[PDB]
Design a protein around this ligand. Structure first.
Ligand SMILES: [Mg+2]
Ligand SMILES: [Mg+2]
Ligand SMILES: [Mg+2]
Ligand SMILES: [Mg+2]
Ligand SMILES: [Mg+2]
Ligand SMILES: [Mg+2]
Ligand SMILES: [Mg+2]
Ligand SMILES: [Mg+2]
Ligand SMILES: [Mg+2]
Ligand SMILES: [Mg+2]
Ligand SMILES: [Zn+2]
Lengths: 63, 190, 107, 170, 52
RNA sequence: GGCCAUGGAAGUCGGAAUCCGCUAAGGAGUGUGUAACAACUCACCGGCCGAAUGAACUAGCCCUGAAAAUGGAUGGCGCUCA
């Protein structure tokens, strides 16, 4: 369903993409674009679990 | 509402001498003189200085106030006609039949002669207004240059040429043939 | 009512970055694309902050606040036309190496 | 041709109420017969009183305070049209309060076909400040150093025939 | 055949128009009302349809 | 070159979608253009001038709505700050 603690890898293997703020913004770019498909993103659809850590849910301030 | 007073300011460049007497405007510039009668409008004129003229309407209603900036624009067009000239460029638009355009002179009059328009055997003739110069562009293929001091005559001759080439009994979205005004500018480039 | 709040956030973050670093010079651009601007801030993650906005808001929002941070005053008549801001503190050479690097021209 | 009247009246005293409250209205009427008539028209729109159960106490003309001082008046109106009932506010230039109301009656007759019977005057106020003037058709006469000519003068002749060419200078 | 540069010039006069829905008038594309008195200067306009 | 449809559709054929990231600026796009991109134009934000501007509604006169048969009737002439 992913992350599978690897959605950061999809962001750091696509490290040359979003010219964001500090790495974690790149993780949000895949968040927005993978919402368009629509599968098992932790149960529902994105633009929801995105907006959790977009405001602040668990913890991804990865360095 | 009968606005108590409405004003517009003409601007006269350095080499131009506007001359107004009893609503008959005579504008003189390096390129010549143009005259226009405005006796059909109720306006008054004040010479502010040699480079500016105030144009005033007193106690005018909505339409009579509306007629003030048009007076301003006409005199400004006269000024730029006698200080810069006018130039309209026309492009010949045809899909199949080439338009054969000549500048002929019959009975002492200049004419624009259009032949083979949409294959017709008819010969179209458009009278060239006085003060208007026609030229077939050498630098451009299928281009006619209409030039002169008076914007009204130049644009009306250009419109005559465009209008005589209207398409009948066809889908004019498909049959786009004709002679169309492509550029409206001045003789002196700016 | 939403415009005056984005205006307030604009002044809030205008003054948040004013005291965090310091002095700034002339910074004018023109015919600069959206992709053109993303390149400078891509290599300037942390050593600089690319402040942006417009002109008329910036001039007055500081001119009236010349009480908590006066000093400028006569420094405002410099703001003309298409001008941005790069908020940092380095040296007259150390920033022009990392900023002037990308240029796009035309015939 | 109108005058401004102060009309004061009251309910007839009863043994229950021997001094009912006195109510005053400022009435713009051509004469004192209509001033007391209009008074009862408005009291019955507001107070449980009638002409049969009431009494007119005083009718007095209110003259202009400065009849040779040029003023701008704002008039608040409530008039009836063919379809509904409307509130309106308009402004007039005149030297007397009465003369502004006379212009008002002519003005709503011409642009809204509102007859005298269709109009209620809510309030007439003299506008002290130039910032109090909201309407542009009277604000244009408050500009500094106002000058304007009167072009195209038509002279009224006593005779049918004139031996010289007509002119319109002035 | 007409070159695309000339086809836009011709289309400016033949195609880029609005049409009155009641009396069939060729109006400027930006027009909000019809200029003809016969229809009452109606605001019921629609773009001139294109070939397809 | 978003996903799926599609011979192809990359914003501008068609369906779930309508998000994110930088922004001050930008829609999974308002158009023209391509077999398709490209291309330009917009949506909004900039620089410029600098004092006003937009929308909805109400009701006066006028206009559209408003087609019949002998030629013709605000009584006629005629009248347009009447
Ligand atoms: Mg046919
Ligand atoms: Mg009551
Ligand atoms: Mg008035
Ligand atoms: Mg009046
Ligand atoms: Mg009534
Ligand atoms: Mg006489
Ligand atoms: Mg009409
Ligand atoms: Mg009618
Ligand atoms: Mg008649
Ligand atoms: Mg009379
Ligand atoms: Zn129409």
């Amino acid at each position: 369903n992913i992350p599978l603690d690897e959605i950061f890898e999809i962001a750091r293997k696509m490290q040359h993409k979003s010219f964001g703020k500090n790495l974690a913004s790149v993780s949000k770019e895949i968040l927005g674009t993978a919402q368009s498909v629509g599968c098992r993103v932790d149960g529902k659809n994105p633009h929801d679990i995105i907006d959790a850590i977009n405001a602040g849910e668990i913890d991804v301030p990865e360095n | 509402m009968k606005y108590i007073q409405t004003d517009q300011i003409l601007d006269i460049p350095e080499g131009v001498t506007v001359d107004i007497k009893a609503r008959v405007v005579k504008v003189t510039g390096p390129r010549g003189e143009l005259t226009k009668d405005l006796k059909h409008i109720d306006v008054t004129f004040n010479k502010i200085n040699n480079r500016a003229i105030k144009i005033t309407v007193h106690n005018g209603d909505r339409k009579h106030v509306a007629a003030l900036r048009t007076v301003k624009s006409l005199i400004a067009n006269l000024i730029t006609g006698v200080t810069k000239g006018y130039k309209y460029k026309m492009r010949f638009v045809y899909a199949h039949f080439p338009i054969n355009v000549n500048i002929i002179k019959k009975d002492g009059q200049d004419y624009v002669e259009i032949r083979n328009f949409l294959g017709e055997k008819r010969v179209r003739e458009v009278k060239i207004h006085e003060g208007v110069t026609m030229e077939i562009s050498s630098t451009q293929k299928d281009e006619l240059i209409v030039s002169g001091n008076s914007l009204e005559a130049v644009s009306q001759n250009a419109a005559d040429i465009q209008q005589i080439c209207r398409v009948r009994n066809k889908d004019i979205r498909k049959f786009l043939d004709g002679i169309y005004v492509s550029e409206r500018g001045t003789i002196v480039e700016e | 009512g939403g415009a005056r709040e984005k205006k307030v956030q604009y002044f809030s973050k205008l003054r948040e970055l004013l005291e965090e670093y310091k002095s700034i010079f002339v910074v004018g651009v023109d015919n600069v694309s959206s992709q053109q601007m993303h390149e400078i801030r891509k290599a300037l993650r942390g050593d600089a902050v690319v402040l942006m906005g417009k002109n008329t808001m910036v001039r007055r929002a500081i001119r009236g606040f010349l009480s908590e941070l006066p000093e400028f005053e006569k420094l405002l008549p410099f703001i003309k036309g298409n001008v941005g801001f790069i908020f940092t503190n380095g040296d007259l050479k150390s920033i022009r190496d990392i900023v002037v690097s990308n240029v796009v021209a035309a015939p | 041709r109108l005058n401004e009247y102060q009309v004061i009246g009251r309910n007839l005293p009863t043994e229950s109420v021997p001094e009912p409250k006195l109510f005053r209205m400022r009435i713009f009427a051509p004469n004192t017969v209509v001033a007391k008539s209009r008074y009862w028209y408005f009291l019955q729109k507001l107070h449980k009183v009638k002409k049969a159960s009431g009494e007119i106490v005083s009718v007095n003309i209110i003259s202009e305070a400065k009849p040779t001082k040029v003023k701008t008046f704002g008039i608040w109106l409530r008039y009836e049209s063919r379809s509904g009932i409307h509130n309106m506010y308009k402004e007039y230039r005149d030297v007397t309060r009465v003369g502004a109301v006379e212009t008002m009656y002519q003005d709503l007759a011409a642009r809204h076909r509102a007859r005298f019977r269709s109009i209620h005057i809510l309030k007439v106020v003299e506008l002290e400040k130039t910032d109090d003037v909201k309407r542009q058709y009277v604000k244009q006469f408050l500009t500094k150093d106002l000058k304007f000519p009167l072009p195209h003068r038509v002279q009224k002749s006593k005779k049918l025939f004139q031996a010289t060419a007509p002119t319109t200078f002035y | 055949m007409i070159e695309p540069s000339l086809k836009a010039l011709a289309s400016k006069y033949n195609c880029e128009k609005s049409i009155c829905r009641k009396c069939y008038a060729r109006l400027p594309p930006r027009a909000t009302n019809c200029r003809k008195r016969k229809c009452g200067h109606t605001n019921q306009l629609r773009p001139k349809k294109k070939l397809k």
